[PDB]
Amino acid sequence: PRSLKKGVFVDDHLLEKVLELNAKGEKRLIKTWSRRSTIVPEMVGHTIAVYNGKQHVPVYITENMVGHKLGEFAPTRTYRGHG
Amino acid sequence: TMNITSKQMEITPAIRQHVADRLAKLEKWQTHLINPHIILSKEPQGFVADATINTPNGVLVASGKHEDMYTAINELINKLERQLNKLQHKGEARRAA
Amino acid sequence: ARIAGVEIPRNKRVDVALTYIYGIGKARAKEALEKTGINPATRVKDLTEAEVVRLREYVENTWKLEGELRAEVAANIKRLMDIGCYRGLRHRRGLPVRGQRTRTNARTRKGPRKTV
Amino acid sequence: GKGDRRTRRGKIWRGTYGKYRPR
Amino acid sequence: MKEGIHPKLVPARIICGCGNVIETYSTKPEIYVEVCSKCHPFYTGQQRFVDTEGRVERFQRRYGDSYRK
Amino acid sequence: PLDVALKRKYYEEVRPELIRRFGYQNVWEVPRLEKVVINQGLGEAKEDARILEKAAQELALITGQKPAVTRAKKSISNFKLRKGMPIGLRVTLRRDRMWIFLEKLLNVALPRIRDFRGLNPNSFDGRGNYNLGLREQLIFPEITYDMVDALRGMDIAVVTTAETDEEARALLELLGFPFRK
RNA sequence: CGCCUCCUAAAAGGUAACGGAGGCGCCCAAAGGUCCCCUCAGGCGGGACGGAAAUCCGCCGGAGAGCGCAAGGGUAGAAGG
RNA sequence: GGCGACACACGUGCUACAAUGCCCACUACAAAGCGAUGCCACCCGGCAACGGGGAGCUAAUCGCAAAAAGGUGGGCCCAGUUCGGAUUGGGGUCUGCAACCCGACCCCAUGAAGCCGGAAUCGCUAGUAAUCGCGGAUCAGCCAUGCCGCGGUGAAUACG
Ligand SMILES: [Mg+2]
Ligand SMILES: [Mg+2]
Ligand SMILES: [Mg+2]
Ligand SMILES: [Mg+2]
Ligand SMILES: [Mg+2]
Ligand SMILES: [Mg+2]
Ligand SMILES: [Mg+2]
Ligand SMILES: [Mg+2]
Ligand SMILES: [Mg+2]
Ligand SMILES: [Mg+2]
Ligand SMILES: [Mg+2]
Ligand SMILES: [Mg+2]
Ligand SMILES: [Mg+2]
Ligand SMILES: [Mg+2]
Ligand SMILES: [Mg+2]
Ligand SMILES: [Mg+2]
Ligand SMILES: [Mg+2]
Ligand SMILES: [Mg+2]
Ligand SMILES: [Mg+2]
Ligand SMILES: [Mg+2]
Ligand SMILES: [Mg+2]
Ligand SMILES: [Mg+2]
Ligand SMILES: [Mg+2]
Ligand SMILES: [Mg+2]
Ligand SMILES: [Mg+2]
Ligand SMILES: [Mg+2]
Ligand SMILES: [Mg+2]
Ligand SMILES: [Mg+2]
Ligand SMILES: [Mg+2]
Ligand SMILES: [Mg+2]
Ligand SMILES: [Mg+2]
Ligand SMILES: [Mg+2]
Ligand SMILES: [Mg+2]
Ligand SMILES: [Mg+2]
Ligand SMILES: [Mg+2]
Ligand SMILES: [Mg+2]
Ligand SMILES: [Mg+2]
Ligand SMILES: [Mg+2]
Ligand SMILES: [Zn+2]
């Protein structure tokens, strides 16, 4: 995965929205186009709306879903099986 | 198994299955119809049903053309039948001398 | 139930024999036999009950094993499946996990062929 | 073994180096 | 007991790998076992064998704090 | 009678601790072990190699006592069972032998169980007896790998003079039966 | 179409109809004699494989089980094992 | 975001099922090409990917570089294995603004199918086939087991 030497990557433009929410006293739904962003320990408890290419999918974040990316919880593909 | 390619056209599972039904006419001769391929297409003047099939005694390669697709599929089958039958009985033609 | 829980094949070289424990490859095998100071060439059937208890004692304490390892791997997938992440989902369908193609192949995850 | 990365033979084929094939 | 159908019970020493020795009775005088109540993890208070982790995951990742506020 | 360590442990350590813990007014009211009844429900020997003389042997080594055979009360279809067929063994350990068995079960056997995480707290009767099932007989010090043809488990009943589950727990726990929760 | 069991059959016996329902034409060398011993089905709880039901442990359980076969009578203070 | 979907079907290939083989170690013999935010000797950290140093070279000078099969020695002993390397868990490295979908690589662990393949069917007549490795275009990286080349070792058989 991303190299330990370099950062733990978050788009800066979401981190701000996250930080702004901590201070003012949380919390509202946060639309984003950042499937690439890591979920970060300060994101826990939010419910972030992740774009999949069609919808912004609501994802409530938990302490167990921390190091993962955002897009891991907003499926890109519709599949109900064959025939 | 059974393979149909519909070229620059949209066709239904209904139509697909109908092709399987027609092609079945070949099962008459009781020889292995190996990996048969039906190709359906639409020229300006009408449809085309192409097919290439390998059997233990050779290959069936033929083509039907008609204003009507269903009719083209049939005309294909005729040619396939004729060839298949030539394969199956040509060997008998020289048991004397 | 020799070491640890499993009875490692006699007749064979102890370095190969130790591989017959879940969670111990070529590598971990090379490592136990140095740390307990015994010849990897010796057949298991030729081990001092001493050399054995050493081997046993080290390995059982150094590395997570047999059932206890499988439990973690299950627990690992357990959670991945329940947080509902994509790698979790692929498990949830028995499908491939590592971004492989599924238009053809993919048989080891799927099972042998399932006719339409 | 050309498909077993964990051997010499494996790494020559993959075009790489490592523990099992050093440089 | 009925004669001739029952294996004899004699004083017997069960020797464990911890180096424990048990004075008991068996149909075999000397036995060597790989484990016992004296050295088994579940028995030995709560000897957390190999995995004294405290999970460790996942809040407990911590590499690092270097993303900014 | 034999001096066997666990037997003595009962009279020395467990006896009194129990009288403390529940306050009995009578020497006979305090919980005793009555019998340990070991059963191999088997029937993997229904027809096949109905030589389970092999198992009767194994049990006879473990308990120091030769089991007697059990046979089916009624004929049963789906298990392939004609009435009168040898499907099980049962050896009834009492007194000294019961103690000797329990000693090794507690000291050596249960330790040797794969992924052993403690006996089951809930396997109690409600009239104060305990039952527990083994998956293999390699658990006992007497049975080596070398000598076994095929893995077979067993049922162990441990029968107490206790009237209640709560009392019987104390007895077995104090004797050293490891309970998980 | 002979034989057995129940009902009809009107509380002794008997009692008809092309009245209502079922069985027999065998079997068992033990499934016979005798001595000794043993007691069921079923319910709840507990117990590796093991399940509604295999075998084991506990409690309750007079007989509802068993008794070669139909039915009836009998029957564990045994006719049952 | 998709082109990477996955009840299925077909074509092309890779790697195998092993002892004329597999692993470890030591040791040989090519050719064609490529190379200035480019190839990178040599030293250092790290099991390693790689990281840090840092010399040379507009290159018949300097580098990619080790060719591999081969040779010597040592293990495996016919076992789904010291065959095979799929799948999965975990830990890392690098490119890149960014590796969830969806990169490659490394290491621990996992260690599938597969015991030579029905009907059918392909290639090749000599430095060919078979087997073995190396380069290049594209290109940040790379899903290349593809393609275009290059040598190494080196057969069988043709009545007709
Ligand atoms: Mg044409
Ligand atoms: Mg292993
Ligand atoms: Mg891929
Ligand atoms: Mg895919
Ligand atoms: Mg290459
Ligand atoms: Mg209970
Ligand atoms: Mg009791
Ligand atoms: Mg044993
Ligand atoms: Mg008569
Ligand atoms: Mg009457
Ligand atoms: Mg009457
Ligand atoms: Mg009357
Ligand atoms: Mg009257
Ligand atoms: Mg009269
Ligand atoms: Mg008799
Ligand atoms: Mg009688
Ligand atoms: Mg008699
Ligand atoms: Mg009962
Ligand atoms: Mg029950
Ligand atoms: Mg069960
Ligand atoms: Mg039961
Ligand atoms: Mg009755
Ligand atoms: Mg009858
Ligand atoms: Mg895309
Ligand atoms: Mg494409
Ligand atoms: Mg196929
Ligand atoms: Mg390929
Ligand atoms: Mg290049
Ligand atoms: Mg295997
Ligand atoms: Mg197989
Ligand atoms: Mg192997
Ligand atoms: Mg291998
Ligand atoms: Mg073989
Ligand atoms: Mg072949
Ligand atoms: Mg081959
Ligand atoms: Mg093949
Ligand atoms: Mg090869
Ligand atoms: Mg490239
Ligand atoms: Zn011990």
B3 to A24, B36, B41: CA distances (angstroms): 63, 6, 14
Please name the residue that has the structure tokens 């039904």.
Answer: B21
- In the three-class reduction of DSSP (H, G, I as helix; E, B as strand; rest coil), residue C71 is classed as helix
Which domains, ranges and CATH numbers included, belong to chain A? 1-83 (3.30.860.10)
* Residue E28 to residue E15: CA distance in whole angstroms: 12
Contacts of C37 (CB under 8 A, 6+ apart): C54
Contacts of F145 (CB under 8 A, 6+ apart): C1, C7, F138
Give this entry's resolution in angstroms.
2.9
* Structural tokens at position C31: 């490592």
The DSSP element (H or E) to which A57 belongs, if any, is: strand A56-60
CA nearest to F2, candidates F101, F99, F142: F99
Residues in chain F within 8 Å Cβ distance of C68 = 115
Whole-number Å distance, alpha carbon D15 to ligand 29 midpoint, is 28
Helices (H) and strands (E) in chain C, counts: 6, 0
**Residues C16-30: b if buried by 16+ CB within 10 A, e if exposed:** bbbbebebbeeebbe
User: Is residue F40 a contact partner of residue F153, using CB atoms and an 8 Å limit?
Assistant: yes
Tell me, what DSSP letter sits at residue F106?
I
CA nearest to C4, candidates F52, B10, E34: E34
Backbone phi, psi, residue F109, to 5°: -70, -65
Q: Are strands E30-33 and F33-40 parallel, antiparallel or unpaired?
A: unpaired
For chain F, how many residues are written? 181
Give nearest nucleotide to C15 (CA–C1').
Answer: H82
User: Is residue F130 a contact partner of residue F34, using CB atoms and an 8 Å limit?
Assistant: no
F104 to E22, E33, F62, F79: CA distances (angstroms): 9, 11, 9, 34
A51 to A43, A57, E11: CA distances (angstroms): 17, 6, 75
Contacts of A79 (CB under 8 A, 6+ apart): none
Per DSSP, helices labelled H in A25-78 are none
* Residue A9 to residue A34: CA distance in whole angstroms: 11
User: Is residue F174 a contact partner of residue F17, using CB atoms and an 8 Å limit?
Assistant: yes
* Structural tokens at position F167: 């009392």
- How was it solved? X-ray
C-beta neighbour count of F39 within 10 angstroms:
19
* Residue E16 to residue C53: CA distance in whole angstroms: 10
Judge if the beta carbon of C101 is closer than 7 A to nucleic acid strand H. Answer: yes
- In the three-class reduction of DSSP (H, G, I as helix; E, B as strand; rest coil), residue B70 is classed as helix
User: Is residue F67 a contact partner of residue F91, using CB atoms and an 8 Å limit?
Assistant: yes
Cβ distance F114 to C67 less than 8 Å, yes or no, reads yes
* Residue A36 to residue E1: CA distance in whole angstroms: 78
Per DSSP, helices labelled H in chain A are 13-24
User: Is residue F152 a contact partner of residue F44, using CB atoms and an 8 Å limit?
Assistant: yes
Please name the residue that has the structure tokens 């707290």.
Answer: F121
Per-residue DSSP letters for F64-90? SS--EEEE-SS-BTTTTB-TT-EEEEE
* Structural tokens at position A18: 């996250």
- In the three-class reduction of DSSP (H, G, I as helix; E, B as strand; rest coil), residue C27 is classed as helix
- Amino acid in the structure at residue A70: L
Note the CA–C1' distance, F73 to G62, in angstroms: 22
